[PDB]
């Protein structure tokens, strides 16, 4: 099976990528999230995520692609309001999202 996993990218001075359950229930609007779908890697950043989280999200996505997929996977960047169909096919319709936490 193609992998399905979700990483919460959160922090500021120290930013960490933590694996969380694949669900909208794991999302908030203050962090970035990487939905790894194997051949496609979705890099989603909340409207209130900060620059350190966004930069860490880009590093994590390229890391998965180059170092775990032999460079052979697409990274797709989306924001709130531009989520692609395949993301919604996996997670279901987008609900309201809570604010992030410090």
């Amino acid at each position: 099976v193609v992998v399905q996993r979700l990483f919460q990218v959160k922090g500021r001075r120290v930013v960490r990528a933590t694996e969380v359950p694949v669900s909208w229930e794991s999302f908030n609007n203050g962090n970035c999230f990487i939905l790894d779908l194997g051949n496609n890697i979705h890099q989603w950043c909340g409207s209130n995520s900060n620059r350190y989280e966004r930069l860490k999200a880009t590093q994590v996505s390229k890391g998965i692609r180059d170092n775990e997929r032999s460079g052979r996977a697409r990274v797709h960047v989306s924001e709130e309001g531009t989520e692609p169909e395949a993301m919604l096919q996996v997670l279901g319709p987008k609900p309201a999202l809570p604010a992030g936490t410090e």
Partner: nanobody
Amino acid sequence: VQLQESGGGLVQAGGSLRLSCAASGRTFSSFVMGWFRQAPGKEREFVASISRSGSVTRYADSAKGRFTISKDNAKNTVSLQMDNLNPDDTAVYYCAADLHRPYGPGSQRTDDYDTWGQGTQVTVSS
């Protein structure tokens, strides 16, 4: 989620055809769509693509100046108007969807398209 094409058939050289593809089923949003063609005995090759909103289009070399891709976002349909056909345009024509791409028109690479219709046959006589 579900793609079904229509409008192919047999046409004289120089003639026109209008293919259409219906998007049905569970759709949550708009998505990239494109048209490919498989000549008798060959592989699938890019013809044209169009972005989620229909605002941007992209065309293969052979399609420039002859074909027009469009979409009706209300009906969830995309069309390929093919004008001034010639015999080597004979192929099965497939509408495909790139559900992962968040913006822009489709790429020209078959492997970027994950959802496919069943295809409509197009024969150009001589």
